[PDB]
Amino acid sequence: VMTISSLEQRTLNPDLFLYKELVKAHLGERAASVIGMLVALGRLSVRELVEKIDGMDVDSVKTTLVSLTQLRCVKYLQETAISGKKTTYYYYNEEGIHILLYSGLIIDEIITQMRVNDEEEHKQLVAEIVQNVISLGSLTVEDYLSSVTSDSMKYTISSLFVQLCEMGYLIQISKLHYTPIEDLWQFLYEKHYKNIPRNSPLSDLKKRSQAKMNAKTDFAKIINKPNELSQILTVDPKTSLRIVKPTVSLTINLDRFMKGRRSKQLINLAKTRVGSVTAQVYKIALRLTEQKSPKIRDPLTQTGLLQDLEEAKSFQDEAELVEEKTPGLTFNAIINSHLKILASSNFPFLNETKPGVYYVPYSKLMPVLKSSVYEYVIASTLGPSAMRLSRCIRDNKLVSEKIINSTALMKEKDIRSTLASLIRYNSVEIQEVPRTADRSASRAVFLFRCKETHSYNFMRQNLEWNMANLLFKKEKLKQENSTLLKKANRDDLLPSELNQLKMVNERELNVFARLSRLLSLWEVFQMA
Amino acid sequence: DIEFINSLLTIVWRFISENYSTTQEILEFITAAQVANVELTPSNIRSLCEVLVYDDKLEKVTHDCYRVTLESILQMFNYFKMFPASKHDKEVVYFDEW
């Protein structure tokens, strides 16, 4: 009745409308059009934009294009065909809009982890600098340096600039860094398939080894190019201190921001399972070791190509051995007593040891991290009953109600009630087995088996539809009070005008804190 | 019959806090004979073991025994309280499909 229950919007926009929602708050109108269409239809051409919508031909497209490129909201690729001419295809780029969904959250960790300089002018300084970085989308050093006032200390803001290069965070602008992982692999696959001067028709399987191995070493140099390079940043001419290259520009990065929050999730698991002191000693280790830790960067070869059935491991364990290599080899050598209490107690998480050197595995750590958080979700959502039965399916696997009723807890009827509450949304599935009848009819045997990626994805439905109505009715709160807000802006009177002024601001503060909260929940669920 | 399933809701209450523990079948061999109402056989060795096994209670460590960590906070992620707000919007975070 009256549809105000928001059943209208409920069914039809999974993923999708997420994107053009955020860019609408960002810009709106034309900007939401192109991206929203860039999502729905996927790969898109310049001329193709005009055809569909028909609105504002060639005036809007060229304007939106450069607008999307500065903030790099579009993945760009150009190539040609055997026939001739040229073509330029655009993709929805990475999860940039997620960075626009981040903003201050990134700047938060930027401010907090910038310690080693105690409570300094830095707070007002780089907050002005970083806000100028992300907003413009790209920053050249000299043109930015020109914005700084004269007859003052010029290297005060450059006191932390070369310190902005730091370890992680801001890196240089490089070339093709924005590029489809599938396409760059195919472009790098050239000079490989192309390589043989009619050599010899022996051992066709050697074409495999040739192309692959040569592509892997050529892939490593490309991905480690933005990762660590000291050339540009560490330049140190005389008559001064170390000063970043005035020519080469910079950009923010996924490295330590996605890492810092991942460490938080580990701390939350830590702090839960130990004291506050143990979490700190485990923390000071993570702060030094976070540089060479792939972690969030883990698959890196996954998107853009096949894995295998057979050779899947020969791919996977090839990564696992380099996930064996770098954690074992490079990381820190041997308060060690408080490490031993972090040692003797291992399960669930980490503290793997080699003779002479100890370090945390980045391979086997994730499964127990996914377990905990997920089990805490069901614990949070439903009562204590729904909790216990989840693992009851996870101890052994795929069994009937016979040994379940026995081994679980107490009562049949309530179990059946929470069984259908558990089986309500996916995640245990159901079994297809007959009893003697070969799919003929009821009374057949039943079992319950754990679900892979299905019991995950329902937390990926929690991604958008949480923030959706959250941000939307916050935006609807704007246009409703829009006549008031414009009056407030011009004023920057009456008893009742100040009332609704505090109203919206209240709702605004609480809705943004609610954005970041469940944001922190989603971030851990995006992997495995 | 009905006498069953109601006997496991009592004797397991506070014995937890008084438990490092050792041998894990001794924990029952302890629990089996106690309270003078006792308990019968190894049928209960695998009972309180594999029933309460999940969601804190006692942790599972090698050489067959039980540890304790995060239940001490619950008996006292955690601490959630003060919900809900009375009216007008927010959350739900359930069903709705999507």
List keywords for this structure.
2 chains, A: 528 residues, three-stranded antiparallel beta sheet, two-stranded antiparallel ribbon, 53% helix, 5% strand, globular, B: 98 residues, alpha+beta, 3 helices
What does this structure look like?
- The structure is cut from a larger assembly and holds chains A (528 residues) and B (98 residues).
- Chain A has 528 residues and is mainly alpha-helical.
- Chain A has 22 helices and seven strands.
- Chain A has helices at 17-26, 30-40, 46-53, 60-70, 96-100, 104-112, 122-136, 141-147, 162-165, 181-188, 205-227, 255-273, 276-289, 312-329, 336-340, 365-381, 384-395, 401-407, 412-422, 454-457, 461-491, 495-524, and strands at 44-45, 74-79, 87-92, 171-172, 250-251, 352-354, 357-359.
- In chain A, the strands form three sheets. Chain A has a three-stranded antiparallel sheet. Chain A has a two-stranded antiparallel sheet with strand order 4-5. A two-stranded antiparallel sheet of chain A has the order 6-7.
- In chain A, strand 2 and strand 3 form a beta hairpin.
- The radius of gyration of chain A is 28 Å and the shape is globular.
- Chain A starts with 16 loop residues before the first helix and ends with a helix.
- Chain B is an alpha+beta fold.
- Chain B is 17% helix and 6% strand.
- Chain B has helices spanning 26-32, 47-51, 71-75; strands at 59-61, 65-67.
- Chain B has a two-stranded antiparallel ribbon.
- The longest helix of chain B is centred in the first third of the chain and has 7 residues, at 26-32.
- In chain B, 5% of the residues are buried.
- The interface between A and B is medium-sized, with 38 and 28 residues.
- Chain B: It comes from Saccharomyces cerevisiae (strain ATCC 204508 / S288c).
- Chain B: Component of the RNA polymerase III (Pol III) complex consisting of 17 subunits. Interacts with BRF1/TDS4.
- Chain B: This is DNA-directed RNA polymerase III subunit RPC6.
- Chain B: Belongs to the eukaryotic RPC34/RPC39 RNA polymerase subunit family.
- Chain B: It is found in: Nucleus.
- Chain A: Keywords: Cytoplasm, DNA-directed RNA polymerase, Nucleus, Phosphoprotein, Transcription, Zinc.
